[PDB]
Amino acid sequence: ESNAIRMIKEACEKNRRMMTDEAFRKEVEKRLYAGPSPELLAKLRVLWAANK
Amino acid sequence: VKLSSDINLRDFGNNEYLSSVQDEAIRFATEQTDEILSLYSQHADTEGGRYVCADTFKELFPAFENKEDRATVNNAIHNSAAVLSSTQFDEVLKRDEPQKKEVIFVTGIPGSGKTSTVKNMMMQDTTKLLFEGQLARPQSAFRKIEQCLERNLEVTIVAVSMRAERASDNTYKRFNEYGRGASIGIMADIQANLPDGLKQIRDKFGDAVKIVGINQDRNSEFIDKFDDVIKMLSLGSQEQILGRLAEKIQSDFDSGKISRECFNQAKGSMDLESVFAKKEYSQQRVVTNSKGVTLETKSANELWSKVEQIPVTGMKAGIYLLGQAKKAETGQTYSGEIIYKDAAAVFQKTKNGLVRHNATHNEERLAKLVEIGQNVSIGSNKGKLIVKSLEYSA
Ligand SMILES: CC(=O)N[C@H]1[C@@H](OP(=O)(O)OP(=O)(O)OC[C@H]2O[C@@H](n3ccc(=O)[nH]c3=O)[C@H](O)[C@@H]2O)O[C@H](CO)[C@@H](OP(=O)(O)O)[C@@H]1O[C@H](C)C(=O)O
Numbered sequence: 001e002s003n004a005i006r007m008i009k010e011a012c013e014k015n016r017r018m019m020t021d022e023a024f025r026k027e028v029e030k031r032l033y034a035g036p037s038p039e040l041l042a043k044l045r046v047l048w049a050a051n052k
Numbered sequence: 053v054k055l056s057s058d059i060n061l062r063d064f065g066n067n068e069y070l071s072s073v074q075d076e077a078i079r080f081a082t083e084q085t086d087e088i089l090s091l092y093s094q095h096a097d098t099e100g101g102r103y104v105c106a107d108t109f110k111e112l113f114p115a116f117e118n119k120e121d122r123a124t125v126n127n128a129i130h131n132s133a134a135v136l137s138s139t140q141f142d143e144v145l146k147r148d149e150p151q152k153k154e155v156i157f158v159t160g161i162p163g164s165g166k167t168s169t170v171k172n173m174m175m176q177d178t179t180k181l182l183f184e185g186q187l188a189r190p191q192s193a194f195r196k197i198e199q200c201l202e203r204n205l206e207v208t209i210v211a212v213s214m215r216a217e218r219a220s221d222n223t224y225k226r227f228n229e230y231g232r233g234a235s236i237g238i239m240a241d242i243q244a245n246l247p248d249g250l251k252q253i254r255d256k257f258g259d260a261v262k263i264v265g266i267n268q269d270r271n272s273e274f275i276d277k278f279d280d281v282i283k284m285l286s287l288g289s290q291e292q293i294l295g296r297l298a299e300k301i302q303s304d305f306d307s308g309k310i311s312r313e314c315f316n317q318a319k320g321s322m323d324l325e326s327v328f329a330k331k332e333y334s335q336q337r338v339v340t341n342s343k344g345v346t347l348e349t350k351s352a353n354e355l356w357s358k359v360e361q362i363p364v365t366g367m368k369a370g371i372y373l374l375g376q377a378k379k380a381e382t383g384q385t386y387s388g389e390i391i392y393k394d395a396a397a398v399f400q401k402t403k404n405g406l407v408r409h410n411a412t413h414n415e416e417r418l419a420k421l422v423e424i425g426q427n428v429s430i431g432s433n434k435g436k437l438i439v440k441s442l443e444y445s446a
Pocket residue numbers: 057058059060061106107126130131132134135137138159160161162163184185186192193233234235238
């Protein structure tokens with residue numbers, strides 16, 4: 001089996017670990033749907049403001 | 053670095069706001085492509101720009117900054133974000149990296165945990181690129197897969213799958229925190245046509261592309277063989293799924309489980325009245341009595357079985373075949389007792405037999421204005437509902 005197929009199976013395990021472990025599930029879902037970071041948002045504001 | 057293709061305009065009609073957001077989005081993506089891609093790679097949570105995704109690109113547009121605006125502006129900025137992702141896909145492939153041999157496509161219905169699954173993947177030395185996107189209409193993915201095969205890269209496709217209802221619950225939570233959920237129209241369109249697109253891809257490329265699945269209904273079960281992936285993903289037609297989703301989002305709003313803003317983003321551009329009118333009650337009836345009403349469906353064996361029971365007082369005995377109900381003609385008043393109601397339809401016994409009203413009439417909700425067992429007249433004066441009670445005692 002390829003490295004990609006092994007990578008997907010190991011991801012499926014951590015999907016199962018999200019269902020039992022609630023501290024693990026909160027730390028994953030915190031990052032995903034936060035938005036841009038304060039560092040990146042500083043860069044973006046200059047980029048947007050420089051080109052109107 | 054120019055964009056890989058032209059950004060398709062959508063017609064927003066008289067919506068002047070979205071029309072202007074679209075143009076400002078296309079201008080930004082076209083003119084600042086070099087600086088946008090640089091910020092995507094070096095600064096966002098994208099594995100140095102190896103995780104490629106149109107949804108992550110939306111965060112670099114100014115219209116998408118505020119949480120309140122995301123559901124509204126999404127369709128106006130999407131195509132710019134998608135073409136930037138396509139441009140980014142191509143720029144990653146241009147990097148001369150002999151060690152990196154693998155390209156992974158992640159696809160599936162919105163709210164099935166694709167991005168959470170991608171976070172739970174650990175990057176490897178051989179991983180070149182990971183692209184999250186729809187393959188239900190796979191024409192654009194053909195150009196992507198084609199380029200991978202030109203450079204002798206190993207292409208894998210992961211089809212993540214989940215029930216439409218459980219997936220819809222995950223998009224609600226996403227909408228309330230992130231600000232973007234997903235429309236039922238696109239959820240049904242992806243889920244119904246994803247098996248066709250994968251099969252279409254399979255015929256075209258064969259063993260060169262490897263297609264696997266993840267069943268999220270069975271604790272993230274990995275599905276190795278292509279025939280098993282098609283069985284997992286075969287969860288009904290586009291009419292069925294859209295029908296079930298239309299009733300779900302409406303029921304959830306009527307009960308007070310989701311807000312009006314969550315309901316509207318899920319509704320999207322859909323005319324729900326038109327979806328509800330397509331629903332069939334062909335093998336269905338309602339039995340009434342002093343205790344209440346009982347919904348029953350008949351199976352191929354010709355046995356009626358009870359689906360639902362609703363206690364109501366003051367009804368006489370009766371059997372009503374819902375599949376033989378006359379559709380209410382607009383601009384006419386129908387008088388009589390309501391014998392059954394659900395998310396899609398309202399069934400009223402008149403003196404000219406059983407009559408069926410849509411539960412919505414020009415975005416006004418008929419169902420909430422009447423109760424089962426109640427005697428009413430229902431008429432529409434110039435696209436405005438007129439419901440009068442006819443209850444009396446004498
Ligand atoms: C179908 C659609 O519009 N959106 C869906 C599609 O995005 P996508 O980026 O794969 O959608 P394409 O526009 O079909 O782009 C595919 C390719 O088509 C070329 N292209 C595209 C546009 C254009 O103008 N010109 C052009 O050439 C280009 O090569 C691009 O890579 O897949 C995502 C991942 O499942 C969905 O996001 P989530 O499931 O994560 O919510 C997304 O739907 C969510 C709910 C939402 O939209 O908000």
